[PDB]
From Swiss-Prot, chains A, B:
Quaternary structure, from the entry: Homodimer.
Family: Belongs to the inositol monophosphatase superfamily.
UniProt record, GO biological process: inositol biosynthetic process; inositol metabolic process; phosphate-containing compound metabolic process; phosphatidylinositol biosynthetic process; phosphatidylinositol phosphate biosynthetic process; signal transduction
Catalytic reactions of this protein: a myo-inositol phosphate + H2O = myo-inositol + phosphate; 1D-myo-inositol 1-phosphate + H2O = myo-inositol + phosphate; 1D-myo-inositol 2-phosphate + H2O = myo-inositol + phosphate; 1D-myo-inositol 3-phosphate + H2O = myo-inositol + phosphate
Entry's Gene Ontology molecular function annotations: fructose-1-phosphatase activity; glucose-1-phosphatase activity; glucose-6-phosphatase activity; glycerol-2-phosphatase activity; identical protein binding; inositol monophosphate 1-phosphatase activity; inositol monophosphate 3-phosphatase activity; inositol monophosphate 4-phosphatase activity
Name of protein: Inositol monophosphatase 1
Annotated control of activity: Activity with myo-inositol monophosphates and D-galactose 1-phosphate is inhibited by Li(+), Ca(2+) and Mn(2+), but also by Mg(2+) at concentrations above 3 mM.
Cellular component terms per the entry's GO annotation: cytoplasm; cytosol
Gene: IMPA1
Effect of residue 79 to N: Loss of activity
Cofactor: Mg(2+)
Sites bearing Phosphothreonine, chain numbering: 154
Binding site for Mg(2+) 2: 76, 79, 206
Annotated source species: Homo sapiens
Pathway named in the protein's UniProt entry: Polyol metabolism; myo-inositol biosynthesis; myo-inositol from D-glucose 6-phosphate: step 2/2
Length: 262, 262
């Protein structure tokens, strides 16, 4: 599996480059998205024809995101679309790989920054060859959180997204940031740059790569309820530690959402 | 005044370095803040003993921020305190310089990124020697905005900060980001990376440096009312153009605040 991983890192860099080259300069973000997943999918089918793959293409072609025991690649060609369009500086290419339904490695590349985050189950997390360690803050009032406002303009939803932000802001927490991509937000928690990231409405391909980088940097992922993280539930709390994770968990309120499963 | 400016750029770099060195490693953010404004203020008094200076030191020592005709340096030693503490990657050193009550140049340095933004009245804006040009988006529904949630946990205030974010989110706009510093947020609008930044509750030293960089990159600053930007009013809309600026202006609601003036 290390060859698979070391392959995936070259494939993340190359994809990274097509995204970056296109950021200098059917809209451009769609043209570049179609090119990079074709690049990414037929490069994994040629070298690994045995392996399965979950992504948005497979879901849109009617297949269900259900993870089996066979090597699956959970691919996100460009994480940070709106960003791409604005040249707002954070877009990531994401690749997560699972065997026996557990993620084995994750590779996230932040194009415009030139940063390559990798992690492998058991061997630790690194940003560009330097090891990552999450923070030690266990006090919620001194923690800095990252989250996003959603892609939904449905007012019942928007009011809850803002309602939950308010409750946490008033705890008080140190502050909240939004950088515009879920994969990069989780890498910021892996470095120690933020203390926790929560979001309800993401998709498994958005988080499968960076989830393992949070944990090999020493953090915890868990469900918005307090229960175990569930890759197909559309919701995540990636934190530096359980204390903080549970805190966030007890205060927010669920936004009903249809599992990636159903 | 170019020597003054070219001096200020070396003084911004050096200060930048003390902030960066201290980010590798009375709390550390206070120790580093006291060191950098001592560095910054006695270096400007020795070379320019004629010149006045507005900053937080002068205000806290009871003097009023009232700008006169004489060369004034409006200094912000570390913009992005909470960030500094978390190692969240964006802290800026800011230096704005005014003669005859109009800003003549601004120099903003984003430490951890290594980026040096400068601008001089009439000669254009540059990030690290490359010229900056704001965006062309005049459609609010495709614009990306940056703003911050405030440093106040007063619930009448928090509810309005979130109330205004909601109205703009529901227009709809493309999205909203928060990077944690006002000086860096305004530089993002100067590059074209975002289309507008608004905030109510900043201080003149937070924005005096980057305001000129927005305008020499081709944008507009204006008051939250639609009127002319007022450096001492505690409020700003830094946009790529008037259309967008006025749009934001007509939708938000004021948070009463005590001028830097009074």
């Amino acid at each position: 599996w290390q060859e698979c991983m070391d392959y995936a890192v070259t494939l993340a860099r190359q994809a990274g480059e097509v995204v970056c080259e296109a950021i200098k300069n059917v809209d451009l973000v769609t043209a570049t998205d179609q090119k990079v997943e074709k690049m990414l999918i037929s490069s994994i089918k040629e070298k690994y024809p045995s392996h399965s793959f979950i992504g948005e293409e497979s879901v849109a072609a009617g297949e269900k995101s259900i993870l089996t025991d066979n090597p699956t690649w959970i691919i996100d060609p460009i994480d940070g679309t709106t960003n791409f369009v604005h040249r707002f500086p954070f877009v990531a290419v994401s690749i997560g790989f699972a065997v026996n339904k557990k993620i084995e490695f994750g590779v996230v590349y932040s194009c415009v920054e030139g940063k390559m985050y990798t992690a492998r189950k058991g061997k630790g997390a690194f940003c560009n060859g330097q090891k990552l360690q999450v923070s030690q803050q266990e006090d919620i009032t001194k923690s800095l959180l990252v989250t996003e406002l959603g892609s939904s303009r449905t007012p019942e939803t928007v009011r809850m997204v803002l309602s939950n932000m308010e409750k946490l802001f008033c705890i008080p927490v140190h502050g909240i940031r939004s950088v515009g991509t879920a994969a990069v937000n989780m890498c910021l928690v892996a470095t120690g740059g933020a203390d926790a990231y929560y979001e309800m409405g993401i998709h498994c391909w958005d988080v499968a790569g960076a989830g393992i980088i949070v944990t090999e940097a020493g953090g915890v992922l868990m469900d918005v309820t307090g229960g175990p993280f569930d890759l197909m539930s559309r919701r995540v709390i990636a934190a530096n530690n359980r204390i903080l994770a549970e805190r966030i968990a007890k205060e927010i309120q669920v936004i009903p959402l249809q599992r990636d499963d159903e």
